[PDB]
From a paper:
pmcRenal polycystins (PKD1 and [name]) are ion channel subunits with associated genetic variants that cause autosomal dominant polycystic kidney disease (ADPKD) (1–3). [name] forms homotetrameric voltage-dependent and calcium modulated ion channels in primary cilia membranes. Each channel subunit encodes six transmembrane spanning helices (S1 to S6) which fold into structural domains: voltage sensor (VSD, S1-S4), tetragonal opening for polycystins (TOP), pore (PD, S5 and S6), and cilioplasmic (N and C termini). The putative external gate is found within the ion selectivity filter (L641-N643) that is scaffold by two reentrant pore helices (PH1 and PH2), and the internal gate is located at tetrameric S6 junction formed hydrophobic residues (L677).
Between 333 K-665 K particles of the variant channels were extracted, processed, and refined with C4 symmetry to resolve their molecular structures at 2.76 Å (F629S) and 2.70 Å ([name]) GSFSC resolution. Like previously resolved WT channel structures, the [name] variant subunits formed a domain-swapped tetrameric channel architecture. In the [name] structure, the guanidinium functional group is replaced by a sulfhydryl, disrupting a hydrogen-bond tripartite network formed with carboxylate and hydroxyl sidechains of the PH1 (E631 and T635), and selectivity filter (D643) residues normally found in WT channels. The ADPKD [name] variant removes a cation-π interaction between R638 and F646 and reduces the coupling between the pore helices of adjacent subunits. The VSDs of the F629S and [name] variants structures are captured in the deactivated state with S4 gating charges (K572 and K575) oriented for hydrogen bonding and cation-π interactions that facilitate gating charge transfer. Despite the localized disruptive interactions, the pitch and secondary fold of the PH1 helix are preserved in the F629S and [name] variant structures and only cause a small dilation (ΔRmin < 0.24 Å) in the external gate. However, examination of the variant channel’s internal gates reveals key differences in L677 and N681 sidechains rotamers that effectively double the length of its restriction (6 to 8 Å) along the S6. Voltage dependence of opening (V1/2) of the F629S and [name] channels were positively shifted (ΔV1/2 = 27 to 32 mV) compared to WT, which dramatically increased the free energy of gating (ΔG°) by 133% (+1.2 kcal/mol), and 152% (+1.8 kcal/mol), respectively. In contrast, the F629S and [name] variants cause partial loss of function having normal trafficking and assembly, but impaired voltage-dependent gating.
Author numbering:
A (entry chain A3), B (entry chain A4), C (entry chain A1), D (entry chain A2): 34 to 115, 126 to 314, 325 to 515
Write the structure that this text describes.
């Protein structure tokens, strides 16, 4: 026994140090202030009424007339504070917003032969083949002439109804309110939005001097082929200026120290079994995170490029995307670095009995999870075919899955289930609740419960 | 052993092909766009304020004055966009809406003898015997003279307080707003709604050229015998024009291939046990679906009849109804086609132990399901007699059943339970929660748990 | 065996007939229309804004100024429809509403000695000893002179802050709006509400000729000793005129047939064990219900007393109360009549195993229910002392009990728990959820589970 | 056996008396009236709209302009009822409110070297080192000159973004509305709030003569370094004048009697065992509560000091703080006094089998609670790093813990989880629900279930 404990103790001390270094690094990413940074930003643009005479938020656009009322009203009064603007007196506006639109060709769809005398034209769903590249209206520059994703230094974006290319027709919005109002009013009078539009984007970014963060804003308004409007938004905080405080220089030392542990674990793996799989997972995700972290040092040259002329649009689109992907993988590595503690938790005959239960159980939990999810996904596809054209909570097959988890827990919206289909709605709900929650979910309890008393009946004797 | 595994494997390959054909066919019915088609429609007619000076939605009518304010206001501005109208610039209005009312005779009920000097008349709940067929008001046309369900090409409808005949008094609404306003104002000035009205219906339909769907609208406003008003609505998508894209012509090949599989399974069943019951259920439901699918081709001639003169009401009532019944049965066939996968899932000693648990358990789960539902329905009938005259969530014996499932899951409205009856409300809630959720629901759990360890203790030894 | 089955079958046939007669009698009490009767009533008086320039409902009074705005505004426009009034064109107003107030004496409490130079008077909480009986203001009749509970034909009422006597100062409101406005404005100008008030009541009643029901309305507005206002309401349906239709005359035969069954069971019991306890409970509650039914036939003469002069308040207060008590007891008899079906449900070796589980288990479930409820009520008293001065959901020891059931199920209001006390709120919630829901609630399940496998291990061998 | 029972009976009889005396004491401090005292107070200041024109509550400030609109508007109309003021006609305003602010130095933070030509200054997060002590503006007394926490008789306060010193810049608000409006307007015109503000406090107190309580009010408005505003409030009832009624004089005897029990139990425990641990807990907390109660008798001289000249701010801040801490420890001692009943509950072979289950189980429940909370806290840190900058329900690591308990119970806000991160949101929610609720939580079930059948299999034989 002792010679195994003597190597395990050195691994445990090494691992507690590795855990502590990553926890210090990742607590160093944020302060409670940063939620209020984005909350105060989003309430100014989203939750201010579109006009002083109107009930609608930007969260509640329904037409091109609402979108013009927003972009002439609530947007401009959010951006331009009385040259410079600070969107609150603490937070500097970085120069110049941008508007971009994406558009579809007239006649890009098959009108049925019976209707062609009555309906002259149609415009498809947005796609790279239906996308429109011809110049239109008065043709006075980039608002009315197409430019590609590569010409515009842009990237493809995931909307609600479609993914969208980084390309389009675009305008840069001036330093001040009176200039920008004349620009947006010129687009409106020239009918810059019409039948062919399928999205618009409004982008800008802001710097907080007091806690040293950049917040990058995207507003995306989609214009479905069914008619109507769908608004959406992003407000992303970034720490582009890496180090300024003594605490940043301490994090910079931990950031170097983390690479020594990752190198040590890469060598130990160079020198089949769940802990070895989890070691590879932790190491690979850490190497990916370090690769993104290193790549971000050259992406930060976009800030150096911007600071030569603050009449340019600050293209922090890629920086925000890779900060999000870094934060995503940092959060996931922290999670797996906690799960590995279960290698060491086996202190005594209680902890080893609990951990032996989970590993001996997982064979049957996996078998029953497939068996459960066939029935759950059959219910998801039943729900999608019955309610998916009526109920927001079921509008996509993805939402059918998430809503069926909400219903099993107790977050239920039964009034809209029944109003969508008075015959199948109650039958679906009643049978889903009965077969999932009163019957099938209790199989997990049976599997776990019998495995635990099995394991305890062995460890009482081994 | 080998020959049985090989014949089962040929059935499994045949079944995976059948499954994939039906999954392709039913994914072919819809796109995420279609929810936004009905959402953008319903928000225009339902959620727009009834008048610019008022707070009420069509969802919140409460009087004949609200209904006239709606039909002179929010309705007309939803229908007529500035001859033709597109209900959004993408969706064509098919010619002509229709208004229909159903009505009850004066003196169709027994006034108590003690009150006949004070109350001169009464008007019953709507029924086929209380229904009024006499001409009234100025008698100028079909708005003031009765016509039968068969004269009107209609069908009987399920409302909230009653089912309703397709018959009645009716008017067709003209091509444009100024014509329709003069028609509706003429009905209002002649007092076309009075003591005897028990429902009105407003019907119309629309076509989306961009994704090739019709949408059929019913608004039903009921006028209960208690006084007051109850609004309700339907917005139904329809794919009447079967095939136009290469993907539709591919789906048409899958539609023929599905008939060959159903023929194969009909012959195999012609050439007592749950899989045989499920095999018959899948076959019969698929034969009914194919029958409705064929009958719908005869019904689609109603579109060809309409397109000769677009100054006429498009009677897609039956097409919408049979599309709903087709979607209803199709969704249910998909569900049972997924459940049949369990005929083949017995890959190994884990999967056979899980499937053997459910079949060996279901005997005792059915016994306890009766025993549970006696107590549950006793509580449902207690709740209906105590709260049914006070609380919306218990306003019918059907609502009581669904609300008691919501309460067991934790979707609860306890403040209105107590305000309805301060003595029995808390007693009902407390005892229901204690006896159902803390006690009786755990019997299912005990039955399953003991069955699983029984089955596992056998399959460890057999 | 056979000689036992032959008597049990005759008891079962007798019991199914008794069950059906009672179920017919209680289905005879209601139609789905009756929910809409009370809903349409309550929305007119409660949910209409207090004044056209105001945001408050009667559900949202907060001052005597709101109460005068309601009683001069929304009340009068709800009652008087343009002599007679129909509260909707279907429902007759029975003559005359009544206003009553209850009041407390000046100096009915002990002002501290340190404060008597600064505070000249105090007025206690309402009680029968603090209650005020002196005439005040101009003393022009019953509005300004006290009359007792017996003088006024009244009864004691259960409010929110206190129970109230049926006594007080009172006024009868006239047949028409212009008369009633002059009466209420005279009370307002004479300052009829002042610091001494502790409640007002506004009472009236209504008749629906179309489904033959009366509705009796109480509005109670309480005026707490803390300052402020608490509104509350009752709308109660009544079937005073019992028999008019062929279905009522059928129910009148069922009503007599039910008395024959109760006589038969009284004799059988005159000719220690749970079924015998349940048999006595059903018989006693049925005899109490028949007694209340017979007493209500004598009370119904109040309608005959009213119908001589409809310029008088219809005192249906007792009829509404005894109908509520009849509905309360009838619903409970129906519940126990369903539970007695378990005396016969033992058809087979599955049903007898399920019923033997509950009877053999209940010994230990009762022991653990006490043991659980000591901890639950300790948490209820902890919550009452910490949150009960801050959070509505804990504002009484009864609310604490009902809210803790809601939290165990999943209906949670955690934001207000934390805002009331940022230190103990999270500690209370976290420990309550952990010890009740993750730990103690699983003891009921463990007791049931082990009892079931015990009972099944015997019935496999006996 | 008998000689153990005869001494245990004397302990039980002594303990029931101790229990009853404490329960009488804690009921004696409170009534359901007190919830309506704080509710009627808070609705006047918080829920009244900020002006006659604006929609915002004090609960919904977002700028210095909202704060000035509140303090010139909704505050003053809540305080000064038409010399004296009663905040409802029952509740006297004690003299004089106070406004205090806390402030940070210009240049107290490191502006990055790249930006110093563009951004002239920054102001840090509030801390005792960044705090500003210099006199500013016109310097006309205590509003414009700093005073220490000790000079101001104050204490340090726990806000939302920070703890705050009791020090600062302050003004005492006059007896009447016209005076107080001129004071607040003078601060507004002199720009008393600016870039450097990090909190303001508005404090006052009130007396209810009718139920003999003081209520002490704090309003705290924070001004984060991100720009924007965060409002918060406290309304605390106090029984400072201890005894006046015969019921208070009865409680004064119980309050002395309680000390004889605490002395008896101090002696008995002075003359490893869990019941002795619980005895030490009950005794120490009771001695601490008695110490706080005795200290509060000396603190009540602050009322006697205030009553000499009411043109002064009543500093009931410490009295309110210690009354809250007394209520906290009183509620907790009541809770542990209920738990000690489990010493005596062992009446019979059912109760001793239930109590033997919980003590024999707790070894493994502690082991698994550590094992569960590693995974739960890993998910908490994952959620904090992903959603914490976007979602209010995750805006701190403490909020993440409480929200994850709400989600396990079925209080869910899934729409905002997905809108914050469309990739990781659904993955986090789905895996959290699956691994916590369908899997890991059910280990607690397995532990308890197997322990109960173990203990019962022993007590069937011992």
């Amino acid at each position: 026994r002792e010679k195994y404990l003597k190597s395990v103790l050195r691994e445990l001390v090494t691992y507690l140090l590795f855990l502590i270094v990553l926890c210090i690094l990742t607590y160093g990413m944020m302060s409670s202030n940063v939620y209020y940074y984005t909350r105060m930003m989003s309430q100014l643009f989203l939750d201010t009424p579109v006009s002083k005479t109107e009930k609608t938020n930007f969260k509640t656009l329904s037409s091109m007339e609402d979108f013009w009322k927003f972009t002439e009203g609530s947007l401009l009064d959010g951006l331009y504070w009385k040259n410079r603007s600070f969107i609150f007196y603490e937070n500097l506006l970085l120069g110049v917003p941008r508007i971009r639109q994406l558009r579809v060709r007239n006649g890009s769809c098959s009108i049925p032969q019976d209707l062609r005398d009555e309906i002259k034209e149609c415009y498809d769903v947005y796609s790279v083949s239906s996308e429109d590249r011809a110049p239109f209206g008065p043709r006075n520059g980039t608002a009315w002439i197409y430019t590609s994703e590569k010409d515009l230094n842009g990237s493809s974006h995931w909307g609600i109804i479609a993914t969208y290319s980084g390309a389009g027709y675009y305008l840069d919005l001036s330093r001040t309110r009176e200039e920008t109002a004349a620009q947006v009013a010129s687009l409106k009078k020239n009918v810059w939005l019409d039948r062919g539009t399928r999205a618009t984007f409004i982008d800008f970014s802001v710097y907080n001097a007091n806690i040293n963060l950049f917040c990058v804003v995207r507003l995306l308004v989609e214009f479905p082929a069914t008619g109507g409007v769908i608004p959406s938004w992003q407000f992303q905080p970034l720490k582009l200026i890496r180090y300024v405080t003594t605490f940043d220089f301490f994090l910079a030392a931990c950031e170097i120290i983390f690479c020594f542990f990752i190198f040590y674990y890469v060598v130990e793996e160079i020198l089949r079994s769940f802990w070895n799989c989890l070691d590879v997972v932790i190491v690979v995700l850490s190497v990916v995170a370090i690769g993104i972290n290193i790549y971000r040092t050259s992406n930060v040259e976009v800030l150096l490029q911007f600071l030569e002329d603050q009449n340019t649009f600050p293209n922090f689109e890629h920086l925000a995307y890779w900060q999000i992907q870094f934060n995503n993988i940092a959060a996931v590595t922290v999670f797996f670095v906690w799960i590995k503690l279960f290698k060491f938790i086996n202190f005594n005959r209680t902890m080893s009995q609990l951990s032996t239960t989970m590993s001996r159980c997982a064979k049957d939990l996996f078998g029953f999870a497939i068996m459960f999810f066939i029935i759950f996904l059959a219910y998801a596809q039943l729900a999608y075919l019955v309610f998916g054209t009526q109920v927001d909570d079921f509008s996509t097959f993805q939402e059918c899955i998430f809503t069926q988890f909400c219903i099993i827990l107790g977050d239920i919206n039964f009034a809209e289930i029944e109003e969508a289909n008075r015959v199948l709605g109650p039958i679906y709900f009643t049978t889903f609740v009965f077969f999932m929650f009163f019957i099938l979910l209790n199989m997990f309890l049976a599997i776990i419960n019998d495995t635990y008393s099995e394991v305890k009946s062995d460890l009482a004797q081994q």
